[PDB]
Design a protein around this nucleic acid. Sequence first.
RNA 1: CCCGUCGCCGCGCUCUCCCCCCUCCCGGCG
RNA 2: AGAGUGGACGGGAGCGGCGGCCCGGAGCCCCGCGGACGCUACGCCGCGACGAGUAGGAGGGCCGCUGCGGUGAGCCUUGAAGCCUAGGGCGCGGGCCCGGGUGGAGC
Lengths: 109, 125, 225, 128, 236
Amino acid sequence: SGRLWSKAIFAGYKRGLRNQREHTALLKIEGVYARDETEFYLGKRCAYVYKAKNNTVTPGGKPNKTRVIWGKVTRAHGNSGMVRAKFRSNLPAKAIGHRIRVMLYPSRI
Amino acid sequence: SAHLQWMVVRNCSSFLIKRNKQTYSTEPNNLKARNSFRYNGLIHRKTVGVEPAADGKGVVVVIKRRSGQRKPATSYVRTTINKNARATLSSIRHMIRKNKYRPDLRMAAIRRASAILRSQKPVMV
Amino acid sequence: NFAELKIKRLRKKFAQKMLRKARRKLIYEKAKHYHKEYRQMYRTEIRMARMARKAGNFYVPAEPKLAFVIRIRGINGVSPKVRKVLQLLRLRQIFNGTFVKLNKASINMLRIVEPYIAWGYPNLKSVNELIYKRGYGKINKKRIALTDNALIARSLGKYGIICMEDLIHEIYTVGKRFKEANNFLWPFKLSSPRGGMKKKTTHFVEGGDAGNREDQINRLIRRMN
Amino acid sequence: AALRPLVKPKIVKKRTKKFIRHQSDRYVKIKRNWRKPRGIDNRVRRRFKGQILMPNIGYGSNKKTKHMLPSGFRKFLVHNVKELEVLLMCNKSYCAEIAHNVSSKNRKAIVERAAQLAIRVTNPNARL
Amino acid sequence: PHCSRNPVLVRGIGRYSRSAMYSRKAMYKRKYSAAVLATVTKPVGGDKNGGTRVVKLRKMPRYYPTEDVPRKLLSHGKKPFSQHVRKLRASITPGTILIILTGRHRGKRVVFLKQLASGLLLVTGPLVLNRVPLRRTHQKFVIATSTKIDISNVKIPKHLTDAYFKKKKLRKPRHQEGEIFDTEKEKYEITEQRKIDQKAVDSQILPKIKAIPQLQGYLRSVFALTNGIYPHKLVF
RNA sequence: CCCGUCGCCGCGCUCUCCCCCCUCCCGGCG
RNA sequence: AGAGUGGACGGGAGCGGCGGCCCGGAGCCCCGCGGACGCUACGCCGCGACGAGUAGGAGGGCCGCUGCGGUGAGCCUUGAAGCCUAGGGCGCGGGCCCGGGUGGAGC
Ligand SMILES: [Mg+2]
Ligand SMILES: [Mg+2]
Ligand SMILES: [Mg+2]
Ligand SMILES: [Mg+2]
Ligand SMILES: [Mg+2]
Ligand SMILES: [Mg+2]
Ligand SMILES: [Mg+2]
Ligand SMILES: [Mg+2]
């Protein structure tokens, strides 16, 4: 019943032109295209959810094929939406262009 | 002399074991079994060591006599103690502290006696 | 012996506690005096200029005796004379400011190392922020954080400088022991300028940073410490 | 169930990969273990971007956790029962490891003596 | 045992100075110049065994570990969690409607009762509306809306604490090996005191909910995001 | 002596006596 | 119990504080018998600053190879050397240790 997370897109890693830093991720959240709108999402949890072959244990449920890399939004990256986030493990490069959930967790509203 | 004999056997001794980043000693009166000036069982005027007993019950405490310092046959007096644990720790503590016989190896002898006792007591399944 | 000995050491501990209380009261009053002196100086300058305007004349204030200098260029490709002057100024790293006392000799060696430093005249707030946040002293060739008036007094008490307020007073009102106080102070290692610089390699009056910005050094110090 | 160490800090390694030798992937005659590349044009010696890294002392590990096994212990190589008796004090900080040359009956004796002496043994099942 | 006599204005700084506090405490007149057991004795139990036995308490350890750990340093902050200051966000006042975000009751709309003594919020859905009992919920994991129910003069039983809400354990009595299984106690029983507390608090909350219009349908519904609305633009 | 809640720095109360305001096992309760 | 940012006594001659019918003048620890770790001084610990590098120099190497004097009441046909290893590890590294297989006499 109902979505309860905002949809973002893994846009790429933090980088200059010829050096990329894979510990920080760049996220484009749908609907926000300025810094003073990115202010709401500034400490929210975020998740890269994906499927694989083997079964993993699910908290409060039965084992299935879904896996999650957890992270959180850390700050804004440049004048038009585009936050930068920090995950527990660095995100795989096959996730670029794909969906990342922003979870409305720890709440300040 | 203790300092001269230590400067001799400090790096060349048949009791020295240098293996991977650690150093040990195996002389028979060495609490903590380490290559140190404090815990050396041969170079001091006064030494205390503890071992398991001949039968598998009790702890033998061997202290070095004062007089016969060049006669190694009579130079050690050893006593076996086959009491319970608290009394054997209290007795060796009383021995060291009340005799004032080198009272810096007291706690090391205490740890060694408790380890020997715990190893002597029967194993549970 | 175990009663006269214990009452003797108790008396000694009491006397040391009373000496501590005396020195605390002294440094409190000294700081109050300096607050009076600073506000008196500020109102005095304003009154002088205001009196000259009322009379119809001009009041030329005293050209300042204290400057804050910051090395703002790196260490690659530096002239030997510029190198020697910068290390006589104790600017051996980039963003590496210090206090200088302004006279003809010091002004001419700043003019020598003009395109490498940004310098200006600090105000009392800038001297407060600099000594409190980034205050390190040189105590037998080591760089020690100024956390203790005992540390300051054990190095500089022979000049009457026994607290951080005494240090700030000497540096701001350049006293007779300014050389000793400024040499006690380790050169300040500032951060990068938050917000940027708009051009590093040209003079401030033509749109850059180098040279003598007069009191815009305080803006730079706020952004940089 | 097992014998715990005294303390168990989190071991932090600055690098888990090995330092392989330049062009050891390109040849069989070049072994994997490290040689420092001396050579006037050599780009890993010159430290160009994206190349093989060279070992240096800044990779050195914290001396509180140096030589520490992944379970809080430091290893000591043992050949017989007397060498186990020398490890009685360490206990919570040093574990034993029977050497590869020790035969079946003697390592049976060693594992029995270490069991009754509460010393940790890294390879307790080696001929059974 | 007097009160503080020096009201604070900013923490760490009292309002009245040192001499003013000297005068207010009146230290000009009240200056003051100057001014187990470890062992017991149990009886004899004779005869020919004479002399009462002097027996000490807390005897010496019969074992010392072969290496010990050195003690810590002193840190001066760092109070335990029971003594921490519990803070609450200003938008959550008693009667506010919150949205549970994370539990089994994800996206649900409840009302806010008292905040408990461990920082956790005590909420209830009116269980006949959205199947949410009296529960605790975290302030960081609720969203606070702007709709109110004035819950003054609602009797809260005093036996409604964190000990009342703390989970219960039964495994495992006296058994060390497990091959047989304990097929009971997985059914968490709703106790009769919990049911009657629920009945009482719902009987005194629900007529106030039926008062304002459409609120019971609003509390029956759940919260969700669709193809339009973005949470940074939503007013709650 | 079961186990250094300690130094410096900033404070609060008591070893003086009066008040007054909400309270309270309240004791009987209107 | 080691205690000294001055300690000595000892007549000398007076106080403050405890013992009154105004006269004063030692407690040598203990109901307990006890009190973590350390200091291979070639060791251990603290603080501050610093770290590019060819040719070249120097230091350390519990890096490695072969043999000799000693030492390990060392190891080994209940399996040595050597070799193989999608096994477990250590070390910045040189390298090393352990598990499994193969092998068959020394290390
Ligand atoms: Mg240049
Ligand atoms: Mg910025
Ligand atoms: Mg140029
Ligand atoms: Mg490695
Ligand atoms: Mg190769
Ligand atoms: Mg070249
Ligand atoms: Mg170098
Ligand atoms: Mg083999």
